[PDB]
Design a protein around this ligand. Structure first.
Ligand SMILES: O=C1Nc2ccccc2[C@@]23OCC[C@@H]2C[C@@H]13
Length: 306
């Protein structure tokens, strides 16, 4: 498998659990710090990053009824400049740039308590596909599906339904939507981190997925596996391989990586393209920092750019 070794440039540092890189509609850059603690308990943060200096501004320190959040992954909305944030303690948040936030759902459409969420991805129809590797949200005790298969997959639809669409995953992590060239949502890809598998489904409509199959396999002997992922404009899937020091590059049909991207750090946790550029911003847990590098082509347009 060919490997490339592009130059990485440091963006910012000192971010506990750095993850959830995202750009809003104005081009501002944000990340999450899931692992910040105060008085011995979770107190994670959502931060805006000055791209010139790497200066960090805390946007939001989400807490609900005295239970602090573990914000873990982000996407930007289209019709309003607001961030959808997957939170491993609080479920799904909508965070405004002014710092105000709302917990969007605490129960699914079957009436059961939400599971804590980690990554999410909008399709072009505005439905948000979400991985939930944690156990029940606060006030339940915090657990994650690293060793047991209780992680779940949700779709939060444009009608405001939070629908559990699959379950029994061993730490579901990155998630991405592949669209037809004409814009129709076609496939959902889900990383099952602790089985080294990427799963695909056919998207038949809002919260409707069928044809579940193993789509690709993640290399590596390390502890970990696929974390965050996103498509480039050719529908190659770039997949951070936590613990392997690489981002894997899959062609549209999956299988084994057709190329690897060597990183100067062990634990890439998430990645996100800067809009209308070939620049990928990468969070990582070796140094708890953010970097950028130049890919071969632009990213796939995100929902917020449509
Ligand atoms: O892929 C991963 N994504 C994220 C994202 C946010 C916070 C922590 C993590 C992880 O850190 C070790 C346990 C968990 C698996 C890694």
């Amino acid at each position: 498998i060919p490997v490339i070794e592009p130059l990485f440039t440091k963006v910012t540092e000192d971010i506990p659990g750095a993850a959830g890189p995202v750009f809003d509609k104005n081009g501002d850059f944000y990340i999450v710090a899931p692992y910040v603690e105060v008085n011995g308990k979770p107190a994670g943060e959502i931060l805006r990053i000055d791209l010139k200096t790497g200066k960090k501004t805390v946007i939001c320190k989400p807490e609900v009824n005295g239970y602090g959040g573990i914000p873990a992954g982000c996407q930007c909305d289209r019709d309003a400049n607001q961030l959808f944030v997957a939170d491993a303690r609080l479920g799904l948040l909508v965070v405004q740039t002014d710092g105000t936030f709302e917990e969007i759902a605490k129960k699914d459409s079957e009436g059961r308590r939400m599971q804590g969420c980690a990554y999410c991805a909008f399709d072009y129809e505005g439905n948000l596909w979400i991985t939930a590797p944690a156990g029940e949200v606060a006030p339940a005790d915090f657990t994650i599906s690293l060793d047991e298969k209780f992680g779940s997959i949700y779709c939060f639809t444009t009608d405001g339904q939070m629908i559990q669409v699959d379950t029994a995953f061993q730490f579901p992590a990155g998630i991405a939507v592949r669209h037809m060239n004409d814009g129709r949502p076609y496939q959902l890809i889900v990383a099952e981190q602790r089985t080294k598998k990427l799963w695909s489904y056919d998207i038949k409509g809002p919260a409707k997925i069928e044809n579940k199959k193993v789509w690709g396999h993640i290399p590596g002997t390390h502890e970990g596996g696929a974390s965050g992922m996103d498509f480039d404009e050719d529908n190659n899937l770039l997949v951070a391989n936590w613990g392997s020091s690489h981002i894997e590059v899959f062609g549209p049909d999956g299988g084994q990586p057709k190329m690897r991207i060597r990183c100067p750090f062990e634990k890439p946790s998430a990645l996100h393209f800067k809009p209308q550029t070939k620049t990928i911003f990468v969070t990582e847990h070796e140094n708890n920092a953010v970097w950028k590098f130049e890919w071969q082509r632009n990213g796939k347009k995100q929902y917020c750019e449509t």
